[PDB]
Amino acid sequence: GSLDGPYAPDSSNLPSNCWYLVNPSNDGVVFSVTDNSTFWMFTYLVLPNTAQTNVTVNVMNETVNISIDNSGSTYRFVDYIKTSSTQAYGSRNYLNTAHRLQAYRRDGDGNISNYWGADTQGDLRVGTYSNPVPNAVINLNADFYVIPDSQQETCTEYIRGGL
């Protein structure tokens, strides 16, 4: 397969209908997005064999706290989400993966899609979140590649088997 890039970390109203495969080297926030009105989302990368740790996250000009706990040898991308600024974030989905690879796509409605699952095999799934942010600034906080949603299958290949 082929991918446009890699491109450096960017914050902008990125084009919809294409997969942004992020390839972080380090843990922490790899992805975030908010319209400042209806939807707040960030993804925190947790290292394998990370004992229970209380960490402080400054993201989207907000500073919050999360508990990370990963007893596996796989990496874990954790999604946190809220629909109002005064609301507390909630963890909805996470992805256990051997590779530092997650991918995000904004559909025609502005909904955010990414890979969910307890593994990158049988439990792997392409999920979609339910609060559309069509014009919101998207923060890809890592080197990323660009794949058309034409080739969701090419993106899936790298998610399962690395790059």
Residue numbers in the entry: 63 to 225
According to the publication:
For rotaviruses (RVs), which are the major causative agents of life-threatening gastroenteritis in children under the age of 5 years and result in 453,000 deaths worldwide annually, recognition of specific cellular glycans for initial cell attachment is mediated by the distally located VP8* domain of the spike protein VP4. Although structurally conserved with a galectin-like fold, sequence-wise VP8* is the least conserved among RV structural proteins contributing to a phylogeny consisting of 37 [P] genotypes9. Our crystallographic analyses provide the structural basis to explain the unique glycan specificity exhibited by a neonate-specific bovine-human reassortant RV strain and its parental bovine strain, each belonging to the P genotype. We have shown that P VP8* exhibits a novel glycan-binding site that adapts to a differential recognition of precursor glycans, which are the core elements of HBGA and human/bovine milk glycans.
Sequence comparison of human and bovine P VP8*s shows 86% amino-acid identity. However, there are several significant amino acid changes from human to bovine P, including S180A, Y183Q, I158N and F192S. To investigate whether the sequence variations within the VP8*s of the same genotype lead to any structural changes, and how they account for differential glycan binding, we determined the crystal structure of VP8* from a P BRV strain B223 at 2.2 Å resolution. Comparison of the human and bovine P VP8* structures shows that despite the overall structural similarity (RMSD=0.66 Å), the J-K loop in the bovine VP8*, which has several sequence alterations undergoes significant structural change. In the bovine VP8*, this loop with a different set of inter-residue hydrogen bonds projects in an opposite direction compared with that of the human VP8*. The backbone conformational angles in this loop from residues G179 to G184 are also significantly altered. Comparative analysis clearly shows that the amino acid changes S180A, Y183Q, I158N along with the altered conformation of the J-K loop in the bovine VP8* result in the loss of the binding pocket for type I Galβ1,3-GlcNAc motif. The residue Y183 in the human VP8* that is involved in a stabilizing hydrophobic stacking interaction with the type I glycan is replaced by Q183 in the bovine VP8*, which in the structure is shifted 5.3 Å away because of the conformational change in the J-K loop. S180, which interacts with β1,3-linked GlcNAc of LNT through stabilizing hydrophobic and hydrogen-bonding interactions, is replaced by A180, which based on the superposition of the structures clashes with this moiety. In addition, I158 that is involved in a hydrophobic interaction with GlcNAc in the human VP8* is replaced by a hydrophilic residue N158.
